[PDB]
Amino acid sequence: DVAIVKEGWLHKRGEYIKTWRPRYFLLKNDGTFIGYKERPQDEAPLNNFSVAQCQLMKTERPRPNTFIIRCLQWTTVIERTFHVETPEEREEWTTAIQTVADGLKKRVTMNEFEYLKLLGKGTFGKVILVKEKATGRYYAMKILKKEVISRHPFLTALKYSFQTHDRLCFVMEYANGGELFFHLSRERVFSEDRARFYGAEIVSALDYLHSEKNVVYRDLKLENLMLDKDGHIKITDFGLCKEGIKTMKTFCGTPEYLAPEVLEDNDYGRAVDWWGLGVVMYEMMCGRLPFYNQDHEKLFELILMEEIRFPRTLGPEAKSLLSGLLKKDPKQRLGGGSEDAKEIMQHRFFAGIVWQHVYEKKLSPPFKPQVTSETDTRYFDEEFTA
Ligand SMILES: *CCC(=O)Nc1cc(NC(=O)NC2CCN(Cc3ccc(-c4nc5cc[nH]c(=O)c5cc4-c4ccccc4)cc3)CC2)ccc1Cl
């Protein structure tokens, strides 16, 4: 029953490098809107490219005949910007997309929290670290503009959702066991066993998002990993889409963790998260990023072309895992097949690991953060500078 509604060439604005790119897009009746570098000859649909519950806007800036697909995915507002040659083509696309979207459609207040610290600013709102006065718990509050608009042990849970007169607010649970980059920086390098533990929990969470939620996390990096009070991994959802910063070109964020297919603004899928897994687990066991340099052109080339290299102190099992995870071609990448996470869970690096015990947190955390409870503020104090 799934068929193509409309297909053709489009100019898509790059998601990390702001240049316009010629891409062949396929609009299907299941809601997927995917672009390709070349017209594909050609299973579960990813919600990352869904046009369901989205609003279309027609703009003449910064380029005439531009249309934008603005979507609210979970707790993050995203924008996909496209360009055509003639206004007639734009109307054809916007009508087709809207038609598909139509066919698919077939108390807690702000005074209850205390402002603590600005976590991040985005185009359509901000993220704030708050503390509930009643319980003393820590939370990350996503405060999004109103007019522009599920539990896993290793994912930051959405606690509350409320709105003001002009703002929509999402309340994330905030781990108090400390940032993982802080822990890795302090201890320089994690052992293979400890990295196996963190890695296993990450795999479990990614497996959940892929099979149950049918979504790609795409932001898997060290900065988005935290530990709770018990030392278990928490993958964070504190992000917001920003506008890039002007090396005369304009870039949005740092590219060191981005998958090659994501950098080239090509078709991407579940394999992206496995690349991220490779980057994270590489840094944990090697003590540094897989690809690093100052020039963005250089950094791109290292990610796109340069083969990953390993220290002599790294074991063959770890080398096999990282080599598979950091394959530049997602079709050849470990976990890039139809088996997805099972391809990684069955890898010999995770031999002996009982994955049911992983999800149920039966595995003893090798590291216990110096906190007494979920309200302990040690990783919020001056020590964080040390
Ligand atoms: C700076 C340049 C730039 O922004 N370019 C750019 C990017 C994009 N696209 C995006 O920004 N996409 C974002 C990628 C990261 N992704 C993170 C994410 C957070 C949360 C979830 C998530 N989703 C669901 C959905 C349904 N049910 C669920 O239970 C969940 C749970 C979670 C989740 C919760 C907690 C922890 C982890 C996951 C998925 C992904 C957000 C989108 C567009 C344009 C441009 Cl220019």
CSV table of C-alpha atoms and ligand atoms in Angstrom, one decimal:
chain,number,residue,atom,x,y,z
A,1,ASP,CA,0.0,0.0,0.0
A,2,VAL,CA,3.0,2.2,0.5
A,3,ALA,CA,3.8,4.1,-2.7
A,4,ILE,CA,5.5,7.3,-4.0
A,5,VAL,CA,3.3,10.4,-4.1
A,6,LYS,CA,5.8,12.7,-5.7
A,7,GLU,CA,9.5,12.6,-6.6
A,8,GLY,CA,12.0,15.0,-8.2
A,9,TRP,CA,15.1,17.2,-7.7
A,10,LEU,CA,15.2,19.7,-4.9
A,11,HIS,CA,17.7,22.2,-3.4
A,12,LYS,CA,18.2,21.3,0.3
A,13,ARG,CA,20.0,23.6,2.7
A,14,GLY,CA,22.8,21.6,4.3
A,15,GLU,CA,22.1,20.6,7.9
A,16,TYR,CA,25.6,21.3,9.2
A,17,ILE,CA,27.3,23.2,6.4
A,18,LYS,CA,24.9,25.9,5.3
A,19,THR,CA,25.4,25.5,1.5
A,20,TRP,CA,22.6,24.5,-0.9
A,21,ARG,CA,22.8,20.9,-2.2
A,22,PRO,CA,21.0,19.2,-5.1
A,23,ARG,CA,19.1,16.2,-3.8
A,24,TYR,CA,16.5,13.8,-5.3
A,25,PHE,CA,13.6,13.6,-2.9
A,26,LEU,CA,11.0,10.9,-2.6
A,27,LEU,CA,7.6,11.7,-1.1
A,28,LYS,CA,5.6,8.6,-0.1
A,29,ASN,CA,2.1,8.1,1.2
A,30,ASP,CA,3.3,6.8,4.5
A,31,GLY,CA,4.7,10.2,5.3
A,32,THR,CA,8.4,9.8,4.6
A,33,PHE,CA,10.2,12.6,2.8
A,34,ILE,CA,13.7,11.5,2.0
A,35,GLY,CA,16.4,13.0,-0.2
A,36,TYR,CA,19.2,11.2,-2.0
A,37,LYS,CA,22.4,12.3,-3.7
A,38,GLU,CA,21.4,10.2,-6.7
A,39,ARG,CA,18.0,8.7,-7.7
A,40,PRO,CA,17.8,5.3,-6.0
A,41,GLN,CA,17.1,2.2,-8.0
A,42,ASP,CA,15.4,0.6,-5.0
A,43,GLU,CA,12.3,-1.5,6.0
A,44,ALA,CA,10.4,0.2,8.8
A,45,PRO,CA,10.0,4.0,8.2
A,46,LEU,CA,12.0,6.4,10.3
A,47,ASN,CA,10.1,9.3,11.9
A,48,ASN,CA,13.0,11.6,11.3
A,49,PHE,CA,11.9,12.1,7.8
A,50,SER,CA,8.1,12.1,8.5
A,51,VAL,CA,6.0,15.1,7.4
A,52,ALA,CA,3.2,14.0,9.7
A,53,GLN,CA,2.2,16.7,12.2
A,54,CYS,CA,4.3,19.3,10.4
A,55,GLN,CA,3.6,22.9,9.1
A,56,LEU,CA,4.8,24.2,5.8
A,57,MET,CA,5.9,27.8,5.2
A,58,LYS,CA,6.7,29.6,2.0
A,59,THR,CA,9.5,32.1,2.2
A,60,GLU,CA,11.5,34.4,-0.1
A,61,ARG,CA,14.4,34.7,2.3
A,62,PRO,CA,17.2,34.1,2.3
A,63,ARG,CA,16.4,32.8,-1.2
A,64,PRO,CA,13.3,33.2,-3.3
A,65,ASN,CA,11.0,30.2,-3.9
A,66,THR,CA,12.0,28.6,-0.6
A,67,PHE,CA,9.7,26.4,1.4
A,68,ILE,CA,10.3,25.1,5.0
A,69,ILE,CA,9.0,22.0,6.7
A,70,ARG,CA,8.8,22.7,10.5
A,71,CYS,CA,8.2,19.7,12.7
A,72,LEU,CA,8.0,19.0,16.4
A,73,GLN,CA,9.9,15.7,17.0
A,74,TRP,CA,9.4,14.5,20.6
A,75,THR,CA,10.7,17.6,22.5
A,76,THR,CA,12.7,19.3,19.7
A,77,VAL,CA,11.5,21.6,16.9
A,78,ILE,CA,13.3,21.0,13.6
A,79,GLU,CA,13.3,22.8,10.3
A,80,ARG,CA,14.0,21.4,6.9
A,81,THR,CA,14.6,24.1,4.3
A,82,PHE,CA,14.2,23.5,0.6
A,83,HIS,CA,14.4,25.5,-2.6
A,84,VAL,CA,13.0,25.2,-6.1
A,85,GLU,CA,13.4,27.1,-9.4
A,86,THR,CA,9.9,28.2,-10.0
A,87,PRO,CA,7.0,29.3,-7.7
A,88,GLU,CA,4.8,26.7,-9.6
A,89,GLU,CA,7.1,23.9,-8.5
A,90,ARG,CA,7.0,25.1,-4.9
A,91,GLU,CA,3.2,25.1,-4.9
A,92,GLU,CA,3.2,21.5,-6.4
A,93,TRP,CA,5.5,20.3,-3.6
A,94,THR,CA,3.8,22.1,-0.7
A,95,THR,CA,0.4,20.8,-1.9
A,96,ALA,CA,1.7,17.2,-2.2
A,97,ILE,CA,3.4,17.3,1.2
A,98,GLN,CA,0.3,18.8,2.8
A,99,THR,CA,-1.9,16.3,1.1
A,100,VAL,CA,0.2,13.4,2.5
A,101,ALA,CA,0.2,15.0,6.0
A,102,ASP,CA,-3.6,15.3,5.9
A,103,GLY,CA,-4.0,11.7,4.8
A,104,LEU,CA,-2.0,10.6,7.8
A,105,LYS,CA,-4.0,12.6,10.3
A,106,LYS,CA,-6.9,10.1,9.4
A,107,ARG,CA,-1.6,21.6,37.9
A,108,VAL,CA,2.1,22.2,37.3
A,109,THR,CA,3.2,25.9,36.9
A,110,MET,CA,6.4,27.8,36.4
A,111,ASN,CA,6.3,29.0,40.0
A,112,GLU,CA,6.7,25.4,41.1
A,113,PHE,CA,10.4,25.4,40.0
A,114,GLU,CA,13.5,27.4,40.8
A,115,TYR,CA,15.7,28.8,38.0
A,116,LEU,CA,19.3,27.6,38.4
A,117,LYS,CA,21.3,27.9,35.2
A,118,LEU,CA,21.0,28.4,31.4
A,119,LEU,CA,21.8,25.2,29.7
A,120,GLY,CA,21.4,26.3,26.1
A,121,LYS,CA,19.7,28.7,23.7
A,122,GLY,CA,18.0,27.8,20.4
A,123,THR,CA,16.2,29.4,17.6
A,124,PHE,CA,12.7,28.5,19.0
A,125,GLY,CA,13.5,28.6,22.7
A,126,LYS,CA,15.9,27.8,25.5
A,127,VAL,CA,16.8,25.0,27.9
A,128,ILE,CA,17.1,25.7,31.6
A,129,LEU,CA,18.3,23.7,34.6
A,130,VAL,CA,15.6,23.9,37.2
A,131,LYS,CA,15.0,22.5,40.7
A,132,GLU,CA,11.5,21.6,41.8
A,133,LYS,CA,11.0,23.4,45.1
A,134,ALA,CA,8.8,20.6,46.6
A,135,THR,CA,11.0,17.6,45.9
A,136,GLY,CA,14.4,19.2,45.4
A,137,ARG,CA,15.0,17.1,42.3
A,138,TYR,CA,16.9,18.4,39.3
A,139,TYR,CA,15.3,18.9,35.9
A,140,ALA,CA,16.1,20.3,32.4
A,141,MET,CA,13.2,22.5,31.2
A,142,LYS,CA,12.8,23.0,27.5
A,143,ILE,CA,10.9,26.3,27.0
A,144,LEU,CA,9.7,26.5,23.4
A,145,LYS,CA,7.8,29.3,21.6
A,146,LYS,CA,4.1,28.3,21.3
A,147,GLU,CA,3.5,29.8,17.9
A,148,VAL,CA,6.0,27.7,16.1
A,149,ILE,CA,4.2,24.5,17.3
A,150,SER,CA,7.6,6.1,26.9
A,151,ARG,CA,10.2,4.9,29.5
A,152,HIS,CA,13.7,3.4,29.1
A,153,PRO,CA,16.1,3.1,32.0
A,154,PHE,CA,19.0,4.7,30.1
A,155,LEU,CA,17.0,7.6,28.5
A,156,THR,CA,16.3,10.9,30.2
A,157,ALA,CA,12.6,10.7,30.9
A,158,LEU,CA,10.1,13.5,30.1
A,159,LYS,CA,8.6,14.2,33.5
A,160,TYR,CA,6.1,17.0,33.0
A,161,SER,CA,4.6,18.9,30.1
A,162,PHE,CA,2.8,22.2,30.6
A,163,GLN,CA,2.4,25.5,28.8
A,164,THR,CA,2.1,29.2,29.5
A,165,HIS,CA,0.4,31.9,27.4
A,166,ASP,CA,3.2,32.0,24.8
A,167,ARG,CA,5.5,29.1,25.8
A,168,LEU,CA,5.4,25.3,25.7
A,169,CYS,CA,7.5,23.6,28.4
A,170,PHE,CA,9.0,20.1,28.5
A,171,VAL,CA,10.5,18.9,31.8
A,172,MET,CA,13.3,16.4,31.5
A,173,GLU,CA,14.8,14.4,34.3
A,174,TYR,CA,18.3,15.6,35.0
A,175,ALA,CA,21.0,13.1,36.1
A,176,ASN,CA,23.1,14.2,39.0
A,177,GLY,CA,25.9,11.7,38.7
A,178,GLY,CA,28.0,14.1,36.6
A,179,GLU,CA,28.8,14.6,32.9
A,180,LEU,CA,30.5,11.7,31.3
A,181,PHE,CA,33.1,14.0,29.7
A,182,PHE,CA,34.0,15.2,33.2
A,183,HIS,CA,34.5,11.6,34.4
A,184,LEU,CA,36.5,10.6,31.3
A,185,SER,CA,38.6,13.7,31.5
A,186,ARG,CA,39.3,13.0,35.2
A,187,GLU,CA,40.3,9.4,34.7
A,188,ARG,CA,41.9,10.0,31.3
A,189,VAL,CA,40.9,6.6,29.9
A,190,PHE,CA,38.3,4.0,30.8
A,191,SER,CA,39.2,0.3,30.9
A,192,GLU,CA,37.7,-2.0,28.2
A,193,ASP,CA,35.4,-3.5,30.9
A,194,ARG,CA,34.1,-0.2,32.0
A,195,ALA,CA,33.6,0.9,28.4
A,196,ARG,CA,31.8,-2.3,27.7
A,197,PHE,CA,29.4,-1.5,30.5
A,198,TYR,CA,28.6,2.0,29.3
A,199,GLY,CA,28.6,0.8,25.7
A,200,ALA,CA,26.2,-2.1,26.5
A,201,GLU,CA,23.7,0.3,28.1
A,202,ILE,CA,23.9,2.7,25.1
A,203,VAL,CA,23.3,-0.2,22.7
A,204,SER,CA,20.2,-1.2,24.7
A,205,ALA,CA,18.9,2.4,24.6
A,206,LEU,CA,19.6,2.7,20.8
A,207,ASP,CA,18.0,-0.6,20.2
A,208,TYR,CA,14.9,0.7,22.0
A,209,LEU,CA,14.7,3.9,20.0
A,210,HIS,CA,15.2,2.1,16.7
A,211,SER,CA,12.8,-0.9,17.0
A,212,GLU,CA,10.1,0.5,19.4
A,213,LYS,CA,10.2,4.2,18.5
A,214,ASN,CA,11.5,3.9,14.9
A,215,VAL,CA,13.7,7.0,15.3
A,216,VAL,CA,17.4,7.8,14.9
A,217,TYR,CA,19.0,9.6,17.8
A,218,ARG,CA,21.7,11.1,15.6
A,219,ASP,CA,23.2,13.2,18.4
A,220,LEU,CA,25.2,10.4,20.1
A,221,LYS,CA,28.3,12.0,21.5
A,222,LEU,CA,30.2,12.2,24.8
A,223,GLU,CA,28.6,15.6,25.7
A,224,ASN,CA,25.1,14.0,25.6
A,225,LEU,CA,26.0,11.2,28.0
A,226,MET,CA,25.6,11.4,31.8
A,227,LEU,CA,25.6,9.1,34.8
A,228,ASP,CA,22.8,8.9,37.4
A,229,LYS,CA,23.4,8.6,41.1
A,230,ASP,CA,24.1,4.9,40.8
A,231,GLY,CA,26.5,5.1,37.9
A,232,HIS,CA,24.2,4.0,35.1
A,233,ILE,CA,24.2,5.8,31.7
A,234,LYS,CA,21.6,8.4,30.8
A,235,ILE,CA,21.3,9.6,27.2
A,236,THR,CA,20.1,13.2,27.3
A,237,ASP,CA,17.4,15.1,25.4
A,238,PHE,CA,18.4,18.7,26.2
A,239,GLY,CA,19.1,19.7,22.6
A,240,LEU,CA,17.6,22.5,20.5
A,241,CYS,CA,18.2,23.4,16.8
A,242,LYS,CA,20.4,26.4,16.5
A,243,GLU,CA,21.5,28.6,13.6
A,244,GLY,CA,25.1,28.1,12.6
A,245,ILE,CA,27.9,30.5,13.4
A,246,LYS,CA,30.1,32.1,10.7
A,247,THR,CA,36.6,29.3,7.9
A,248,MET,CA,34.5,32.1,6.2
A,249,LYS,CA,31.6,29.7,5.8
A,250,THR,CA,28.8,29.0,8.3
A,251,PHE,CA,28.9,25.9,10.4
A,252,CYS,CA,26.3,24.7,13.0
A,253,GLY,CA,28.1,23.1,15.9
A,254,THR,CA,31.2,20.8,15.9
A,255,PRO,CA,31.5,18.0,13.3
A,256,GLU,CA,33.9,15.7,15.2
A,257,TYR,CA,31.1,13.3,16.1
A,258,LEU,CA,29.0,13.5,12.9
A,259,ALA,CA,28.6,10.4,10.6
A,260,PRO,CA,30.0,10.8,7.1
A,261,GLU,CA,26.6,10.3,5.4
A,262,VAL,CA,25.2,13.0,7.7
A,263,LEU,CA,28.0,15.5,6.8
A,264,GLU,CA,27.4,15.0,3.1
A,265,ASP,CA,23.6,15.6,3.6
A,266,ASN,CA,22.9,12.2,2.1
A,267,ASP,CA,20.3,9.6,3.0
A,268,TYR,CA,20.9,8.3,6.5
A,269,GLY,CA,19.3,5.7,8.8
A,270,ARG,CA,19.9,3.7,11.9
A,271,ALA,CA,23.6,3.2,11.1
A,272,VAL,CA,24.2,6.9,12.1
A,273,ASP,CA,23.8,6.0,15.8
A,274,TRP,CA,26.2,3.1,15.5
A,275,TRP,CA,28.8,5.6,14.1
A,276,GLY,CA,28.1,7.7,17.2
A,277,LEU,CA,28.6,4.6,19.3
A,278,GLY,CA,31.9,4.0,17.7
A,279,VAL,CA,33.1,7.6,18.3
A,280,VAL,CA,32.0,7.5,22.0
A,281,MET,CA,33.5,4.0,22.7
A,282,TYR,CA,36.7,5.0,20.8
A,283,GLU,CA,37.3,8.0,23.1
A,284,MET,CA,36.5,6.0,26.2
A,285,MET,CA,39.1,3.3,25.4
A,286,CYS,CA,41.7,5.4,23.6
A,287,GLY,CA,41.5,8.7,25.5
A,288,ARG,CA,40.9,10.9,22.5
A,289,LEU,CA,38.6,11.6,19.6
A,290,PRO,CA,38.9,9.3,16.5
A,291,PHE,CA,39.3,12.3,14.1
A,292,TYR,CA,40.6,15.6,15.3
A,293,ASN,CA,42.0,18.8,13.7
A,294,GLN,CA,41.4,22.6,13.6
A,295,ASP,CA,40.5,23.2,9.9
A,296,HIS,CA,36.9,22.2,9.2
A,297,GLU,CA,38.0,21.2,5.7
A,298,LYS,CA,40.7,19.0,7.3
A,299,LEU,CA,38.3,17.7,9.9
A,300,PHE,CA,35.8,16.8,7.1
A,301,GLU,CA,38.5,15.0,5.1
A,302,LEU,CA,39.5,13.0,8.2
A,303,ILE,CA,36.0,11.9,8.8
A,304,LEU,CA,35.1,11.3,5.2
A,305,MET,CA,38.4,9.8,3.9
A,306,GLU,CA,41.0,9.0,6.7
A,307,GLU,CA,40.9,5.4,8.0
A,308,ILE,CA,40.6,5.1,11.8
A,309,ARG,CA,43.8,4.1,13.6
A,310,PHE,CA,44.2,2.4,17.0
A,311,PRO,CA,46.7,2.4,19.8
A,312,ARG,CA,48.9,-0.6,20.4
A,313,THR,CA,47.4,-1.1,23.9
A,314,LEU,CA,44.0,-1.8,22.4
A,315,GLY,CA,42.8,-5.4,22.2
A,316,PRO,CA,41.7,-7.2,19.0
A,317,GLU,CA,38.1,-7.5,20.2
A,318,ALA,CA,37.8,-3.7,20.8
A,319,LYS,CA,39.6,-3.0,17.5
A,320,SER,CA,37.1,-5.3,15.6
A,321,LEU,CA,34.2,-3.5,17.2
A,322,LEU,CA,35.5,0.0,16.6
A,323,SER,CA,36.5,-0.8,13.0
A,324,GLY,CA,33.0,-2.1,12.3
A,325,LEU,CA,31.3,0.8,14.0
A,326,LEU,CA,33.4,3.4,12.2
A,327,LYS,CA,33.0,2.1,8.7
A,328,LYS,CA,32.5,5.1,6.5
A,329,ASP,CA,29.9,3.3,4.3
A,330,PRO,CA,26.8,2.8,6.5
A,331,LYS,CA,25.8,-0.3,4.3
A,332,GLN,CA,29.0,-1.9,5.4
A,333,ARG,CA,29.0,-0.5,9.0
A,334,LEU,CA,28.5,-2.8,12.0
A,335,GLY,CA,24.8,-2.7,12.9
A,336,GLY,CA,23.9,-1.1,9.5
A,337,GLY,CA,22.2,-4.3,8.3
A,338,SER,CA,18.6,-5.3,8.8
A,339,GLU,CA,19.4,-6.9,12.2
A,340,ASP,CA,20.5,-3.5,13.5
A,341,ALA,CA,21.5,-3.7,17.2
A,342,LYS,CA,21.5,-7.5,17.2
A,343,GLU,CA,24.6,-7.3,14.8
A,344,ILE,CA,26.4,-5.5,17.7
A,345,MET,CA,25.0,-7.4,20.7
A,346,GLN,CA,26.3,-10.6,19.0
A,347,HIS,CA,29.7,-9.1,18.5
A,348,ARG,CA,32.5,-10.9,20.4
A,349,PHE,CA,33.4,-7.7,22.3
A,350,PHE,CA,30.1,-8.1,24.2
A,351,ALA,CA,30.6,-11.8,24.7
A,352,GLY,CA,29.2,-12.9,28.1
A,353,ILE,CA,27.0,-9.9,28.3
A,354,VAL,CA,23.4,-10.9,29.1
A,355,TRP,CA,21.3,-8.2,27.4
A,356,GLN,CA,18.2,-8.9,29.5
A,357,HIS,CA,20.3,-8.2,32.6
A,358,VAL,CA,21.5,-5.0,30.9
A,359,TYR,CA,18.0,-3.6,30.4
A,360,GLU,CA,17.0,-4.6,33.9
A,361,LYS,CA,20.1,-2.9,35.3
A,362,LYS,CA,21.3,-6.2,36.9
A,363,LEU,CA,24.9,-5.3,35.9
A,364,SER,CA,26.8,-3.7,38.7
A,365,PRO,CA,28.2,-0.2,37.7
A,366,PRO,CA,32.0,-0.3,37.8
A,367,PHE,CA,32.0,3.3,39.0
A,368,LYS,CA,29.9,4.9,41.8
A,369,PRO,CA,29.5,8.7,41.6
A,370,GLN,CA,30.2,10.6,44.9
A,371,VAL,CA,26.5,11.4,45.6
A,372,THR,CA,24.3,10.5,48.5
A,373,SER,CA,21.0,10.8,46.6
A,374,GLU,CA,19.3,12.4,43.5
A,375,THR,CA,19.4,15.8,45.3
A,376,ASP,CA,23.1,15.8,46.1
A,377,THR,CA,24.6,18.8,44.3
A,378,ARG,CA,28.2,17.8,44.2
A,379,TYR,CA,28.5,17.8,40.4
A,380,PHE,CA,26.9,21.2,40.4
A,381,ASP,CA,29.4,22.8,42.7
A,382,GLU,CA,32.9,24.5,42.3
A,383,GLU,CA,34.5,21.0,42.2
A,384,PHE,CA,33.3,20.7,38.6
A,385,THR,CA,36.2,23.1,37.7
A,386,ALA,CA,38.7,20.5,39.1
B,1,LIG,C1,23.4,22.9,14.2
B,1,LIG,C2,23.0,22.4,12.8
B,1,LIG,C3,21.6,21.8,12.7
B,1,LIG,O1,20.8,21.8,13.7
B,1,LIG,N1,21.2,21.3,11.5
B,1,LIG,C4,20.0,20.8,11.4
B,1,LIG,C5,19.6,19.6,12.0
B,1,LIG,C6,18.3,19.1,11.9
B,1,LIG,N2,17.9,18.0,12.5
B,1,LIG,C7,18.0,17.9,13.8
B,1,LIG,O2,18.5,18.7,14.5
B,1,LIG,N3,17.6,16.7,14.3
B,1,LIG,C8,17.7,16.4,15.7
B,1,LIG,C9,18.8,15.4,15.9
B,1,LIG,C10,18.9,15.0,17.4
B,1,LIG,N4,17.6,14.4,17.9
B,1,LIG,C11,17.8,14.1,19.3
B,1,LIG,C12,16.8,13.3,19.8
B,1,LIG,C13,16.2,13.6,21.0
B,1,LIG,C14,15.2,12.8,21.5
B,1,LIG,C15,14.7,11.7,20.8
B,1,LIG,C16,13.7,10.9,21.3
B,1,LIG,N5,12.6,10.8,20.4
B,1,LIG,C17,11.5,10.0,20.8
B,1,LIG,C18,10.4,9.9,19.9
B,1,LIG,C19,9.3,9.2,20.3
B,1,LIG,N6,9.3,8.6,21.4
B,1,LIG,C20,10.3,8.7,22.4
B,1,LIG,O3,10.2,8.1,23.4
B,1,LIG,C21,11.4,9.4,22.0
B,1,LIG,C22,12.5,9.6,22.9
B,1,LIG,C23,13.6,10.3,22.5
B,1,LIG,C24,14.7,10.4,23.5
B,1,LIG,C25,14.4,10.8,24.8
B,1,LIG,C26,15.4,10.8,25.7
B,1,LIG,C27,16.7,10.5,25.4
B,1,LIG,C28,17.0,10.1,24.1
B,1,LIG,C29,16.0,10.0,23.1
B,1,LIG,C30,15.3,11.4,19.5
B,1,LIG,C31,16.3,12.2,19.0
B,1,LIG,C32,16.6,15.5,17.7
B,1,LIG,C33,16.4,15.9,16.3
B,1,LIG,C34,17.4,19.8,11.0
B,1,LIG,C35,17.8,21.0,10.3
B,1,LIG,C36,19.1,21.5,10.5
B,1,LIG,CL1,19.6,22.9,9.7
